[PDB]
Amino acid sequence: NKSDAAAKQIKKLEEDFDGRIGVFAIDTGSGNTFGYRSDERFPLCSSFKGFLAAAVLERVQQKKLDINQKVKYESRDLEYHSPITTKYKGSGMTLGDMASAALQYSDNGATNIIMERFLGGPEGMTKFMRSIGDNEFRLDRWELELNTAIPGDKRDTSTPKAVANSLNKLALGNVLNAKVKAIYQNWLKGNTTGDARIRASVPADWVVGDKTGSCGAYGTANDYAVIWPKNRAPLIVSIYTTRKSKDDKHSDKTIAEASRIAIQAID
Ligand SMILES: *C(=O)N1C[C@H](NOS(=O)(=O)O)CC[C@H]1C(N)=O
Ligand SMILES: [Cl-]
Ligand SMILES: [Cl-]
């Protein structure tokens, strides 16, 4: 019945802002879980960039790539929203710096460059996810087109549960070795976009690593996080939303609230 109460609360919240909320949360210290719409599809938007950074680190770990190899792009027309790659166009960036920009600032140039040159495009990004046992995730298009968040479209979607399981595996599990996982965690912990989301749903002294997504259409926005509560084993929270209408804006406050509810549901 605690699951049932949390379900009623999410259902009401999603009705209050005329949209759809999907939630999965895991307490890693007990195995307890909470889901609502946990198997339904939601656009990933920028959130997939957190997995794209994990894929680079796996490549590094495998000695396929080097974390400090110079990535050069002096002639490229940077995609819109490339705040970090635009500052280093003249000089190039290290591969590790590039991947972390794609994660912590959602940098679109960084994303496109990495998929074109190191990850085998959207199909290769999908391949990596299948290789960690994620069967729901799919990326179909490149930046910026992956963001259209058309209702009923299944391109560039995943499920809250699968995203949560995958972040569990990547941030806490054993896909990455102890060394390279620490780096991923640090990247996550220093995300710059997430302050009004899962982060705002927890005490200021809990440590959080997250990655947000804001398609910019259909009120579509999301966040996933590892939370290290003080004196307790880590939580995983995954929150996805869509809204009914094209011009609807996303709601940071609904995400934060949905995370507050999900985190009490697994208390
Ligand atoms: C991510 O969805 N995008 C990059 C940028 N927003 O960063 S955030 O989503 O992490 O907050 C603008 C919108 C969107 C994109 N690819 O256009
Ligand atoms: Cl996923
Ligand atoms: Cl957040």
Which characteristics define this entry?
Beta-lactamase, binds (2S,5R)-1-formyl-5-[(sulfooxy)amino]piperidine-2-carboxamide, five-stranded antiparallel beta sheet, alpha+beta, 267 residues, 39% helix, globular
Annotate the secondary structure layout.
Elements: H1 2-16, E1 19-27, E2 33-36, E3 42-43, H2 49-61, E4 70-71, H3 83-87, E5 93-94, H4 95-104, H5 108-117, H6 121-131, E6 157-158, H7 160-172, H8 178-189, E7 207-214, E8 221-228, E9 235-243, H9 252-265
Antiparallel strand pairs: 1-2, 1-9, 3-6, 4-5, 7-8, 8-9
Bound molecules: (2S,5R)-1-formyl-5-[(sulfooxy)amino]piperidine-2-carboxamide and chloride ion (CL) (2 copies).
Family: Belongs to the class-A beta-lactamase family.
Keywords: Antibiotic resistance, Disulfide bond, Hydrolase, Signal
InterPro entries: Beta-lactam/transpept-like, Beta-lactam_cat, Beta-lactam_class-A
Walkthrough of the structure:
The protein has helices at residues 2-16, 49-61, 83-87, 95-104, 108-117, 121-131, 160-172, 178-189, 252-265; strands at 19-27, 33-36, 42-43, 70-71, 93-94, 157-158, 207-214, 221-228, 235-243. By secondary structure, the chain is of the alpha+beta class. The chain has a single domain (2-265), classed as DD-peptidase/beta-lactamase superfamily (Beta-lactamase), CATH 3.40.710.10. The protein has a 5-stranded antiparallel beta sheet with strand order 2-1-9-8-7, with helices on both faces. Bound molecules: (2S,5R)-1-formyl-5-[(sulfooxy)amino]piperidine-2-carboxamide and chloride ion (2 copies). The PDB classes it as hydrolase. Keywords: Complex, NXL.
